[PDB]
Amino acid sequence: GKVLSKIFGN
Ligand SMILES: *C(=O)CCCCCCCCCCCCC
């Protein structure tokens, strides 16, 4: 959701 961009690593 909004974490949705870290657990995306890179
Ligand atoms: C929001 O919509 C995504 C939330 C990010 C953390 C939990 C979702 C996990 C599903 C995405 C797979 C990413 C690698 C586990």
Method: NMR
Please state, as a whole number, how many other Cβ atoms lie within 10 Å of the Cβ of residue 1. Answer: 4
- Going from the Cα of 4 to the center of ligand 1, the distance in angstroms, rounded, reads 5
Tokens of 1: 């959701």
Contacts of 3 (CB under 8 A, 6+ apart): none
- State if residue 3 touches ligand 1 by the CB under 6 angstroms criterion: yes
Both tokens assigned to 8: 């995306």
- Find the DSSP H helices in the chain: none
Instruction: Please give the Cα distance from 1 to 7 (Å, whole number).
Output: 10
